[PDB]
Write a protein that binds this ligand. Structure first.
Ligand code: SLY
Ligand code: CL
Ligand code: CL
Ligand code: CL
Ligand code: CL
Ligand code: CL
Ligand code: MG
Length: 348
């Protein structure tokens, strides 16, 4: 057991192992409080997150377990990993506080591309890395659900990691009106058409790749309905085959009220883009999610010829998510979380 020290940071008590020095607040949210620190054990600059009210309800205690299980599992170059997890408690009886440690991230994709377009070579490398990370995530039957530029960290060498997985239901208010939180969402999840699956992430990659090529948001809708009209104008109104797969009767009736439109010519929309970039966008931005290209298929597309290496695109160890259908008490989720904290093995 390391020695812990206490200090108060912006009306918040922090009790952390001595290895973590020079803590300074970086962010605050509903989820918790975040400090930058220097890790004397590894020489890395790190983010330390103190979870807020981790065991306040069953909903909160289950979210805390979900987040720790997910971060402990993810071991890939293009995905955020867990450097450390600690509690000051010396027993389950006094356990209340959970702290998560990850590599400090300097810039997100917005910081390299806010109101700006990039070279084709930069777009190839950046989208290759997202898909390498998604092949790994999807091989464990994990759906990210919230891919957008602010959830992608990038360094001065254009190296990229995926972070901030979807682990809480987003609030109704958070998805309302002119907001980046909805611009990257697949239509089937934005409007609750049907049970969604991992193909929602590929729709988000199509929206990010379009915005790197043009320097403009692809579908910046002022609300859910405006955003759907922008989508259907590019990819066309749905045929009978997709209309059948929409479980909601009222969602089906609403779509049928719209005048029919054909799919546009993507070479006339993405003027001057590499023809291989236009071809891959037509394969991602498909309205019927059954027909979209998968991350494993996209890695073999000619657009990535200079980066693709089928001996260095690894898959994940199996991930058990059976806990998600388990009905447990607060103290039972808390005990499961405690065991996961004490069994943590640091990376080499
Ligand atoms: N949002 C402006 C934009 C800029 C560049 C390329 C596409 C684009 O969005 C479109 C274009 C055509 C139909 C639907 C969306
Ligand atoms: Cl220490
Ligand atoms: Cl990492
Ligand atoms: Cl504690
Ligand atoms: Cl964003
Ligand atoms: Cl597992
Ligand atoms: Mg985020």
């Amino acid at each position: 057991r390391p020695t812990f020290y206490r200090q108060e940071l912006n009306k918040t008590i922090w009790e952390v192992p001595e290895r973590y020095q020079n803590l300074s607040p970086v962010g605050s949210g509903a989820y918790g409080s975040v400090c930058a620190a220097f890790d004397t054990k590894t020489g890395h600059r790190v983010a330390v997150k103190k979870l807020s009210r981790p065991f306040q309800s069953i909903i909160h205690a289950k979210r805390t377990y979900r987040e720790l299980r997910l971060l402990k599992h993810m071991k890939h170059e293009n995905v955020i990993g867990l450097l450390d997890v600690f509690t000051p408690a010396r027993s389950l009886e006094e356990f209340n506080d959970v702290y998560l440690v990850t590599h400090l991230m300097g810039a997100d994709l917005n910081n390299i591309v806010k109101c700006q377009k990039l070279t084709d070579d930069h777009v190839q490398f950046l989208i290759y890395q997202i898909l390498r990370g998604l092949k790994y995530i999807h091989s464990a039957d994990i759906i990210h659900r919230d891919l957008k530029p602010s959830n992608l960290a990038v360094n001065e060498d254009c190296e990229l990691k995926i972070l901030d997985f979807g682990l809480a239901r987003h609030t109704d208010d958070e998805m309302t009106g002119y907001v980046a939180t909805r611009w990257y969402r697949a239509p089937e999840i934005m409007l609750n058409w049907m049970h969604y699956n991992q193909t929602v992430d590929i729709w988000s990659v199509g929206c990010i790749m379009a915005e790197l090529l043009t320097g403009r948001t692809l579908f910046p809708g002022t609300d859910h309905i405006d955003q759907l009209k922008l989508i259907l104008r590019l990819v066309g109104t749905p045929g009978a085959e997709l209309l059948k797969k929409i479980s909601s009767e009222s969602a089906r009736n609403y779509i049928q009220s719209l005048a029919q439109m054909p799919k546009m010519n993507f070479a006339n929309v993405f003027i001057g883009a590499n023809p291989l970039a236009v071809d891959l966008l037509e394969k991602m931005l498909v309205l019927d999610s059954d027909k979209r290209i998968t991350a494993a298929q996209a890695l073999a597309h000619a657009y990535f010829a200079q980066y693709h290496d089928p001996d260095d695109e690894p898959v994940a160890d199996p991930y058990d998510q059976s806990f998600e259908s388990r009905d447990l008490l607060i103290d039972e989720w808390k005990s499961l979380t405690y065991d996961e904290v004490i069994s943590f093995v640091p990376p080499p």
